[PDB]
Design a protein around this ligand. Structure first.
Ligand SMILES: NC(=O)CC[C@H](N)C(=O)O
Ligand SMILES: NC(=O)CC[C@H](N)C(=O)O
Ligand SMILES: NC(=O)CC[C@H](N)C(=O)O
Ligand SMILES: [Mg+2]
Ligand SMILES: [Mg+2]
Ligand SMILES: [Mg+2]
Ligand SMILES: [Mg+2]
Ligand SMILES: [Mg+2]
Ligand SMILES: [Mg+2]
Ligand SMILES: [Mg+2]
Lengths: 443, 443, 221
């Protein structure tokens, strides 16, 4: 462990914490929370706090449901801002049923499920290195976001300077001085676009850190008259945002993807694991790419993938293997975007990985040069399948895949489809202005 | 023939026509023309006038290819308003290849081609009674259309009073002067929505009239400071515009759907015709509903059909059989909208119809009870398939159907699919504000 | 009168189609069309094919006269049915010379590079000249095009007889003077002044700092 009961109780009093956030996540990755006064800390810690866990369903919510909040002492942090009438702290939580057993519909409990699944396969840890990219827009006079970007910088160029706003900096600085362990940051292709990358960790810790990240970001940028967004494709004709996930499996504390005397120094396991991501992509896209707008980013020309394939050096491969070996031997899935619920994504990915490891699946040819030109037909004759063009399509594929459905859980699954189909249904019946411009005088 | 080149030449003079409009239609429904001074009437009549035939292929045009214009003297018309300097007149023309053969790309030639099929099966005529519905919005100071309607009238309401505007009256009064045979007009179920019904007529002559119609409407509308539109679904949340087509088959000038001592007075010739529409509807939709915006009209809640089935009394059936019998015995198709290209719509329809007659297709049970209650499973488990949700689907479907492909023509089919696909691809990559509204703060 | 402004400016709007003024030409010898030869390939006479050949020869030279203004070279850009290469065909996307279908009396060569800003008396002078210079010297026309101008590369178009038009007024001018047959087609007075005015027009243009240049560099540098 990291923190013990009394360690926490000492921390709270000394640091003058006065407001605890009991933090959790809903199906739509949205970050929920029940918040108590410091004085309630005890009730909390004894796992006695109750709330309406149907909040987990998001808007598909129908009936109320009393559930318990189980804090996780090791996820205890004190927020650096705060300090008004006292400081704030949080606890990430696992949602239990009123009968003491963990609530399945909880995404955090769901990953812990597939993780245990991994251990039965005899593995030690599942590592994630995420690279979450975001846009910073400006807030208008009313304090309302606009389409104005925070700068005009590009890829990796030093911008903005150290005199003023410099969100990215102040974010990494806050994160670092707040327990985080960041690797690096940089400006991204599109103007106003940014990326912070954290050191790898185990799935749960990595997903918890992604949810805390987003928040800390959203927060910092608001503080500088800016609006942060993790919306995949906010603007047509510019780069969208994505969250490539760097994945690695350990066995007995040792990377199991690596192998010196091998080809590419990638272990047989590696090759199999990859194999799995290859055959489940089209059927797990709906989860890694959960919003309607997610598929507007999945268009050719913007670094984002569009076909199921893996390379070591290509324009925009679904999967790619970075240079480093040894401990850094890893598989990177580049489909995933920020909108995705980290817990659901990691669980649907781990699950597809293990599946290919379990059933010893044969990884396909690594793609050399050109998936862009090589038209549909040819691309097909090479076993290169296209991702779903729309959320609708993505759903029809997810619903067809037995193992992917099992990765979610009857409850999580049922409600996730429920949400997405209504989400799509709305967007489909909507008459966008584009239609009016194209058709109103034409016809 | 209604005129002889002498009555034409005579009339042109006594009436002082100074400008001839040789009008034809492109594959995209659009109404085109080449204008020549009266001093060239002779060159036109002798089928000598040339132009860029590839204009028929619309925006997917690549190379330029000359072609002739053969004016149909029976389609002669002297526009009423036209003055100052002299009058104007028109000729609907057929497109011929530089080498005397008819251009296979011309949608008007196509109809005539399918119509011939009909003749081979001994039927004399194929009749159409179209129900063209359209919206009327206001022009701003700049002469630009607005989202504001010219009235707040309702279904069959006495729209605009006989003082001033009354566009629907003037349209009809002008149409009647031009030797039109109008059955009756009326206000439709939404503010600014109008309808004018024509007397039944033969497929070609009626199809020609539809085109002329939208012209006259367009013209007079502006004349009143308004903007006519046949866009199937101008605005989300109100009724869409459709163009039902009352179809009937004649075997030597004697309605072949009528059958006195018969079940519902519908002959077996009729019953088959229904069947053909039923099986093919899903496949001919991309043609009768050519626009992206077309599928926003094909949504539950209005009178527009969302699934295949015929009935004599229903909420919104794809096929409906009106009361009148004898010479008035007809099948009504209610999916077609005013954006569809008349000549193509009839070819694809005649095509599915005849396909059902010659193959003695068995028509399904007519629906009666609320299909609105039966969901997919229920509807599915019966002869009730859903129509295509998006242009994309309507296209795949269409291009799958061998008999609906032979209905169009290789030339016409090649480009129609090309245009439509790009139309779709442009819409798919577009980022609409709705998306920014939904996601820019949620994520 | 109708409250509008007509322009014959070649390319008023970036990214939209430009205005051209194709020219259908024909030579008559004894009241008959010297271009029509019903019996030879494409019913085109040896007279006709020669004429075409000369246009192919002097195209890159006369473009400064048939497309005089600076804006004219903005229309000479790929994508809009305006020719960019010296070539001919009876049927292609954007040929410099097109041969229409009509035969007999209607047998003609259409030159598609000419824009409406050209001077009609100079554009025909130069065009007739390149054409007379072909018949006079019996010049051989190359092969027409099948279907690959914008498709291949400049180095590829090059590995054939297909050269590009000048990409600028300044470039087109340097080509105009290089040619003696074309210069003579105007003559001392017309030639000297045209050059003097066009060169100026061009120096004027090239010293100008545009909003585009400020949009890209003002901040980036
Ligand atoms: N790898 C990169 O930095 C490119 C990110 C790009 N926005 C994407 O969607 O993948
Ligand atoms: N007659 C009706 O009410 C049907 C028209 C309806 N607007 C459809 O579309
Ligand atoms: N299609 C055409 O008429 C070609 C003319 C074109 N605007 C050039 O320049
Ligand atoms: Mg429920
Ligand atoms: Mg990146
Ligand atoms: Mg990356
Ligand atoms: Mg073509
Ligand atoms: Mg109606
Ligand atoms: Mg009706
Ligand atoms: Mg021309």
């Amino acid at each position: 462990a990291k923190y013990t009961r009394e360690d926490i109780e000492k921390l709270v009093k000394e640091e003058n914490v006065k407001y605890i956030r009991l933090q959790f996540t809903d199906i739509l990755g949205t970050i929920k929370n029940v918040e108590i006064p410091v004085s309630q800390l005890g009730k909390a810690l004894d796992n006695k706090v109750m709330f309406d866990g149907s909040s987990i369903e998001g808007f598909v919510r129908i009936e109320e449901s009393d559930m318990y909040l189980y804090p996780d002492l090791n996820t205890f942090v004190i927020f650096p801002w705060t300090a008004e009438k006292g400081k704030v702290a949080r606890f990430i939580c696992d949602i239990y049923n009123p009968d003491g057993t963990p609530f399945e519909g909880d995404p955090r409990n769901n990953l812990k499920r597939i993780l245990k699944e991994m251990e039965d396969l005899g593995f030690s840890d599942f590592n994630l290195g995420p690279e979450p990219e975001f846009f910073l827009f400006k807030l208008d006079e009313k304090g309302e976001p606009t389409l104005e970007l925070n700068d005009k910088g590009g890829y990796f160029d030093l911008a903005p300077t150290d005199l003023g706003e410099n969100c990215r900096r102040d974010i990494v600085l806050e994160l670092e001085e707040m327990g985080f362990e960041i690797e690096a940051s940089h400006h991204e292709v599109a103007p106003g676009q940014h990326e912070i990358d954290f050191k790898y960790a185990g799935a749960v810790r990595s997903c918890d850190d992604i949810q805390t990240f987003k928040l800390v970001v959203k927060t910092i940028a608001r503080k500088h008259g800016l609006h942060a967004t993790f919306m995949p494709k906010p603007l047509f004709g510019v780069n969208g945002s994505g969250m490539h996930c760097n994945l690695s499996l350990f066995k007995n504390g040792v990377n199991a993807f690596f192998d010196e005397n091998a080809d590419l120094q990638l272990s047989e396991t590696a090759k199999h694991f990859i194999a799995g991501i290859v055959k489940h992509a089209t059927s797990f896209t709906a989860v890694t790419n959960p919003t309607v707008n997610s598929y507007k980013r999945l268009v050719p020309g913007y670094e984002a993938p569009c076909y199921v394939a893996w390379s070591a050096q290509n324009r925009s491969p679904l999967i790619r293997i970075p240079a480093s070996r040894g401990i850094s031997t890893r598989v990177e899935v580049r489909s995933v975007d920020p909108a995705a619920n980290p817990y659901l994504a990691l669980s649907v990915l781990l699950a597809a990985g293990l599946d290919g490891i379990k059933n010893k699946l044969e990884a396909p040819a690594p793609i050399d040069r050109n998936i862009y030109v090589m038209s549909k037909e040819e691309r097909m004759e090479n076993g290169i399948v296209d991702l779903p063009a729309t959320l609708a399509e993505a759903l029809e594929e997810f619903k067809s895949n037995e193992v992917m459905v099992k990765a979610l859980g009857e409850h999580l699954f049922e409600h996730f489809i429920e949400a997405k189909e209504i989400e799509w249904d709305m967007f489909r019946t909507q008459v966008h202005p584009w239609e009016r411009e194209q058709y109103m005088s034409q016809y």
